[PDB]
Amino acid sequence: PPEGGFGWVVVFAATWCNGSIFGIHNSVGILYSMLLEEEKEKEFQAAWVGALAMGMIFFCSPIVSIFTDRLGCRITATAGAAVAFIGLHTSSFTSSLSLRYFTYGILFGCGCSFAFQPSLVILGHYFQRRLGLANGVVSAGSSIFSMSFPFLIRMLGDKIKLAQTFQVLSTFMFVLMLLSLTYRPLLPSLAQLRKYFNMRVFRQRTYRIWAFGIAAAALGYFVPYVHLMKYVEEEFSEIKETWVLLVCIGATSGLGRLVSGHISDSIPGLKKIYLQVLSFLLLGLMSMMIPLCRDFGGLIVVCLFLGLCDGFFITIMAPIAFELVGPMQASQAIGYLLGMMALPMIAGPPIAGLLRNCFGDYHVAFYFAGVPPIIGAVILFFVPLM
Amino acid sequence: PPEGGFGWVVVFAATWCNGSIFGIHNSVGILYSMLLEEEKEKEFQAAWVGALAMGMIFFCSPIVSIFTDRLGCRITATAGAAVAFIGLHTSSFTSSLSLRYFTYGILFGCGCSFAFQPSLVILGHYFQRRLGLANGVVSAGSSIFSMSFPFLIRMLGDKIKLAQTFQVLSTFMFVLMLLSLTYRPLLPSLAQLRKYFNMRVFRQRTYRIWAFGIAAAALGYFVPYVHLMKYVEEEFSEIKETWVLLVCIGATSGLGRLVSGHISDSIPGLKKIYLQVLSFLLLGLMSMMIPLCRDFGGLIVVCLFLGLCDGFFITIMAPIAFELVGPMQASQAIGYLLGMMALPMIAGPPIAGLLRNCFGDYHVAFYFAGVPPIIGAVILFFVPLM
Ligand SMILES: CCCCCCCCCCCCCCCCCC(=O)OC[C@H](COP(=O)([O-])OCC[N+](C)(C)C)OC(=O)CCCCCCCCCCCCCCCCC
Ligand SMILES: N[C@@H](Cc1cc(I)c(Oc2ccc(O)c(I)c2)c(I)c1)C(=O)O
Ligand SMILES: N[C@@H](Cc1cc(I)c(Oc2ccc(O)c(I)c2)c(I)c1)C(=O)O
């Protein structure tokens, strides 16, 4: 492992992936608004496709792993980038409703998953000892890029039209393909289903319990951002532009990603899991103490803490997987962990909204968002004892 | 050399290049017409950029060769395809006059040259004994694809608009990039200018005289198609749709490409050059006997012969270069031959038009188009004597 050098170049490519994928998805809602402007001059489906894209990313990793194991990081990443580019291109072309849904959701999500998992796998390939620092740098850069995307996307959208926006996103995907072409391998590479789906990583019950804890904790991850924005917009009004929450969340999340990437490098072994546990607990608390402040003063601090803990957890995830299962079978571990997190991630916000509708208040929604992090914290705390 | 097998796959990729490049250029005029439709609702520059693109292709081969020698066929071809894709993309975006000229001409032509020369070089890499057959197949397929392009291009253009057309051409270029990624190498790979521009191939005076003859002959290549169409449209009117000439030219050119690719495989050595000489002479005659028939009956036959000879010469070119200079330095020979042909090719049609304007009749234009082929025939006839 070079521990740097050309690895840094790979890191750049890795960044250009998270950033792009996740930024083109954080902007999905904006696109729909533009579609509404084009819906006239001649139903509630935006959320369905918006969640379908990310859900497809997560659901298709259990398989992207099969490939990256067999084919390799470069081939899988390039194929995913190509599929994403074609999805965006065909979305630009077609002017319809069902075909747009199929194209965007299926093609873009599948390509995004294929281009996303090999990035983490190759990052592990190169450093293997400073993996914490590399993951922190990648997370911080990707966060900055993803935040930056909506501004330009909305300005272009207000400028001309939707198809041009899809063209711009497609060229972004093309540049991602070109960069992903740099994942130079550095490590050795009826019964067909039994060899493609060996599920050998699911032995070593420490990984099993770790994955269970992460999956349980992910059930309350996507609530306290979208629901927090909708709740501050609806309740806690009479405030000026309410942008402080978003900006502080982003800044502290980036700083926490960098800091956690750096510090995780120091802890010897499975003690790294403790870094998650702590953060997990905080997350839960930082949710349960969101609606207890009558003024925005407490909201600023709670949002700062929320973003810091989010960055901690996000950047910490992958190095722990590589330490747990080793480098040879880290791709399978990452893929199956993402697949397991797939369902709670999409099931969280819907449950929060359903509870809000049933009770009419966001209190229960935020409490139920905060509890699963604590449950996962307990499970992960028990993990390293063996 | 496999003499086939995976080489055939490469052949397919090779086809997808000529076809695309040359088809997107044969359609350039159509695009300008569409621009004229968009010029209203709010000068004579079409020919300048249309010729600039092809001229840039030819002018930049003397260098593309340097690269393909040093970097390799795959890297150079992929870079050229990427530059072409970005050129088409930015042409789709910008709505102006000077920026469109710069983008299309410079970017598209440079990318086209970069993606074009390595195709021939790799075709030589793989077969090396059936190179005649491979070149014939490539030429026939590329001719069919290039003649097919204008129909779809014009139908889409009449459908919606120009930017969508540029998007479609850009995705064509992207597919060309993906295919060009298959050029797997099979052969070993103040003073900086003296090593990058060694010009070692320009020894072995047989190659020198061959290149001189080809350059002289190319001076009268592009006249008897564009000027022939304009002359049949202007003079020889009262005829139904005048499509017989074009269709017969294309069909016989494809058939001749295939047949010459096959037969050239049989001639042992430098005797292959004779195949050019013969065809060259015919070309000249087939020009000088264009305006001597008062009815279209002779025109059909003369066009058939013209297309047959054109296919002969086009498909024959490269195998002779590989036989002459060998496989190691065939890339430099091809690149410098293309660079030398660059100037007469662009200087021919302008001289034909100038003579037509000065005299007012196409007779002198066609005579001067036919003579240079005969001069080149004489030179190439003298070539193999040594
Ligand atoms: C302003 C202008 C800017 C210009 C832009 C910049 C241009 C310069 C950059 C050019 C790029 C750099 C050159 C690239 C070099 C590439 C060579 C290389 O590195 O190796 C190639 C790489 C690896 O080659 P390799 O050489 O390294 O292989 C290593 C093995 N040894 C060591 C033996 C050589 O090739 C690949 O493996 C990539 C395969 C990816 C396959 C993708 C195809 C998937 C298709 C999916 C289907 C999509 C269709 C969807 C269907 C939809 C249906 C509706
Ligand atoms: N807030 C994020 C959303 C987001 C959150 C989580 I947990 C995700 O799963 C990860 C993340 C990092 C890893 O190293 C691994 I292994 C899995 C993903 I993929 C996305 C965003 O939208 O950018
Ligand atoms: N009629 C063609 C025009 C065209 C004619 C000639 I001569 C060209 O130079 C070649 C051709 C084949 C070779 O093997 C070599 I080496 C050089 C090119 I490039 C294009 C078309 O427009 O398709």
Side-chain angles (χ1 to χ4, degrees):
Chain A
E3 304 308 326
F6 184 76
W8 288 125
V9 180
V10 170
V11 154
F12 184 82
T15 312
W16 193 279
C17 151
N18 286 46
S20 305
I21 296 141
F22 291 117
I24 297 174
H25 283 78
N26 297 6
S27 94
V28 85
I30 304 192
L31 297 163
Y32 202 91
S33 289
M34 281 158 17
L35 207 70
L36 295 194
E37 310 256 10
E38 319 210 37
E39 165 203 49
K40 305 282 281 152
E41 318 323 318
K42 69 101 176 179
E43 273 42 69
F44 40 85
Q45 320 311 136
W48 272 45
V49 180
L52 171 68
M54 296 269 237
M56 204 58 32
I57 282 165
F58 294 110
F59 301 137
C60 291
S61 289
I63 316 285
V64 180
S65 124
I66 293 171
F67 288 92
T68 167
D69 268 347
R70 314 222 172 288
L71 268 48
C73 302
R74 173 152 49 191
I75 296 95
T76 326
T78 322
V83 176
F85 170 90
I86 310 152
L88 289 163
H89 220 57
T90 53
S91 310
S92 152
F93 282 124
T94 185
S95 82
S96 100
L97 51 154
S98 87
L99 202 47
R100 211 87 67 99
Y101 302 163
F102 151 82
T103 293
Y104 183 82
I106 311 313
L107 270 58
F108 191 45
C110 295
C112 281
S113 99
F114 271 77
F116 169 65
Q117 206 245 322
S119 77
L120 311 155
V121 175
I122 199 83
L123 285 187
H125 264 198
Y126 268 84
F127 292 62
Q128 188 266 325
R129 188 266 304 277
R130 290 168 96 194
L131 198 45
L133 190 58
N135 289 131
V137 169
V138 168
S139 297
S142 58
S143 167
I144 297 301
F145 210 35
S146 57
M147 289 192 350
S148 97
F149 249 80
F151 288 62
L152 85 89
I153 271 174
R154 68 148 70 94
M155 100 186 193
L156 309 210
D158 290 64
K159 197 181 138 47
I160 56 205
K161 79 174 146 71
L162 172 63
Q164 303 291 132
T165 278
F166 271 123
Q167 260 207 80
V168 179
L169 306 180
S170 92
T171 167
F172 260 111
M173 262 311 103
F174 168 81
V175 175
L176 163 60
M177 154 173 322
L178 282 188
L179 275 182
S180 146
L181 208 48
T182 195
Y183 292 160
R184 286 234 296 266
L186 201 87
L187 256 51
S189 286
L190 68 166
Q192 302 90 327
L193 173 136
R194 297 236 187 202
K195 52 157 186 267
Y196 288 175
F197 299 83
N198 48 32
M199 277 150 206
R200 84 165 54 82
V201 86
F202 262 104
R203 305 135 168 71
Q204 181 195 12
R205 96 191 175 278
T206 50
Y207 172 79
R208 285 214 316 279
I209 305 154
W210 183 67
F212 292 169
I214 302 289
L219 185 57
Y221 186 79
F222 268 76
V223 176
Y225 293 170
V226 301
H227 275 50
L228 174 78
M229 270 321 278
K230 284 153 61 153
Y231 148 64
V232 298
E233 183 202 277
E234 175 196 281
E235 196 271 297
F236 242 103
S237 54
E238 157 276 339
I239 299 173
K240 51 154 278 167
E241 180 164 357
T242 189
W243 269 25
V244 61
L245 312 179
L246 302 103
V247 299
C248 100
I249 286 275
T252 190
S253 174
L255 159 70
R257 282 144 192 259
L258 204 58
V259 172
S260 266
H262 173 57
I263 177 164
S264 191
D265 250 9
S266 151
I267 301 200
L270 268 44
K271 284 181 195 336
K272 296 162 149 53
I273 299 192
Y274 284 129
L275 279 191
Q276 301 209 286
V277 171
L278 206 47
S279 75
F280 268 12
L281 267 176
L282 291 208
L283 272 185
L285 305 178
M286 301 307 85
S287 268
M288 296 175 190
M289 316 289 158
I290 270 168
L292 269 54
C293 36
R294 78 266 163 263
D295 68 357
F296 77 103
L299 268 179
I300 304 311
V301 155
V302 82
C303 281
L304 275 162
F305 266 121
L306 210 40
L308 211 184
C309 295
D310 175 352
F312 250 73
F313 162 59
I314 288 304
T315 186
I316 285 272
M317 201 95 78
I320 303 193
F322 262 92
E323 174 67 345
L324 256 189
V325 284
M328 271 325 298
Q329 61 224 88
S331 92
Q332 176 158 88
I334 291 165
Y336 274 88
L337 172 56
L338 272 155
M340 291 185 88
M341 282 156 29
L343 173 49
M345 280 219 155
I346 306 313
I351 296 162
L354 170 162
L355 282 157
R356 162 57 182 69
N357 272 14
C358 95
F359 209 157
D361 193 0
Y362 270 104
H363 267 262
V364 300
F366 275 83
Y367 300 143
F368 269 70
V371 165
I374 296 170
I375 273 168
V378 168
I379 299 193
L380 293 197
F381 171 47
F382 274 148
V383 161
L385 264 294
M386 49 229 64
Chain B
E3 304 308 326
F6 184 76
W8 288 125
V9 180
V10 170
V11 154
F12 184 82
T15 312
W16 193 279
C17 151
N18 286 46
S20 305
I21 296 141
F22 291 117
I24 297 174
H25 283 78
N26 297 6
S27 94
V28 85
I30 304 192
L31 297 163
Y32 202 91
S33 289
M34 281 158 17
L35 207 70
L36 295 194
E37 310 256 10
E38 319 210 37
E39 165 203 49
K40 305 282 281 152
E41 318 323 318
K42 69 101 176 179
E43 273 42 69
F44 40 85
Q45 320 311 136
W48 272 45
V49 180
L52 171 68
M54 296 269 237
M56 204 58 32
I57 282 165
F58 294 110
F59 301 137
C60 291
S61 289
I63 316 285
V64 180
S65 124
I66 293 171
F67 288 92
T68 167
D69 268 347
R70 314 222 172 288
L71 268 48
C73 302
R74 174 152 49 191
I75 296 95
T76 326
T78 322
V83 176
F85 170 90
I86 310 152
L88 289 163
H89 220 57
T90 53
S91 310
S92 152
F93 282 124
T94 185
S95 82
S96 100
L97 51 154
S98 87
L99 202 47
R100 211 87 67 99
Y101 302 163
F102 151 82
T103 293
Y104 183 82
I106 311 313
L107 270 58
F108 191 45
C110 295
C112 281
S113 99
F114 271 77
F116 169 65
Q117 206 245 322
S119 77
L120 311 155
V121 175
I122 199 83
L123 285 187
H125 263 198
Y126 268 84
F127 292 62
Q128 188 267 325
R129 187 266 304 277
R130 290 168 96 194
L131 198 45
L133 189 58
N135 289 131
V137 169
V138 168
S139 297
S142 58
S143 167
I144 297 301
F145 210 35
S146 57
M147 304 181 343
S148 97
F149 249 80
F151 288 62
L152 85 89
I153 271 175
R154 68 148 71 94
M155 100 186 193
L156 309 210
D158 290 64
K159 197 181 138 47
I160 56 205
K161 79 174 146 71
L162 172 63
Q164 303 291 132
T165 278
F166 271 123
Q167 260 207 80
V168 179
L169 306 180
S170 92
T171 167
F172 260 111
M173 262 311 103
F174 168 81
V175 175
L176 163 60
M177 154 173 322
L178 282 188
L179 275 182
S180 146
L181 208 48
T182 195
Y183 292 160
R184 286 234 296 266
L186 201 87
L187 256 51
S189 286
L190 68 166
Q192 302 90 327
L193 173 136
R194 297 236 187 202
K195 52 157 186 267
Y196 288 175
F197 299 83
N198 48 32
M199 277 150 206
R200 84 165 54 82
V201 86
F202 262 104
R203 305 135 168 71
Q204 181 195 12
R205 96 191 175 278
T206 50
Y207 172 79
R208 285 214 316 279
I209 305 154
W210 183 67
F212 292 169
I214 302 289
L219 185 57
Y221 186 79
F222 269 76
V223 176
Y225 293 170
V226 301
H227 275 50
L228 173 78
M229 270 321 278
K230 284 153 61 153
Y231 148 64
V232 298
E233 183 202 277
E234 175 196 282
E235 196 271 297
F236 242 103
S237 54
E238 157 276 339
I239 299 173
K240 51 154 278 167
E241 180 164 357
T242 189
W243 269 25
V244 61
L245 312 179
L246 302 103
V247 299
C248 100
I249 286 275
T252 190
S253 174
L255 159 70
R257 282 144 192 259
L258 204 58
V259 172
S260 265
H262 173 56
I263 177 164
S264 190
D265 250 9
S266 151
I267 301 200
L270 268 44
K271 284 181 195 336
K272 296 162 149 53
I273 299 192
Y274 284 129
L275 279 190
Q276 301 209 286
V277 171
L278 206 47
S279 75
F280 268 12
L281 267 176
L282 291 208
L283 272 185
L285 305 178
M286 301 307 85
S287 268
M288 296 175 190
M289 316 289 158
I290 270 168
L292 269 54
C293 36
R294 78 266 163 263
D295 68 357
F296 77 103
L299 268 179
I300 304 311
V301 155
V302 82
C303 280
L304 275 162
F305 266 121
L306 210 40
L308 211 184
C309 295
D310 175 352
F312 250 73
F313 162 59
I314 288 304
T315 186
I316 285 272
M317 201 95 78
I320 303 193
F322 262 92
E323 174 67 345
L324 256 189
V325 284
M328 271 325 298
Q329 61 224 88
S331 92
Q332 176 158 88
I334 291 165
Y336 274 88
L337 172 55
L338 272 155
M340 291 185 88
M341 282 156 29
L343 173 49
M345 280 219 155
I346 306 313
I351 296 162
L354 170 162
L355 282 157
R356 162 57 182 69
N357 272 14
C358 95
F359 209 157
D361 193 0
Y362 270 104
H363 267 262
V364 300
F366 276 83
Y367 300 143
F368 269 71
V371 165
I374 296 170
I375 273 168
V378 168
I379 299 193
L380 293 197
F381 171 47
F382 274 149
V383 161
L385 264 294
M386 49 229 64

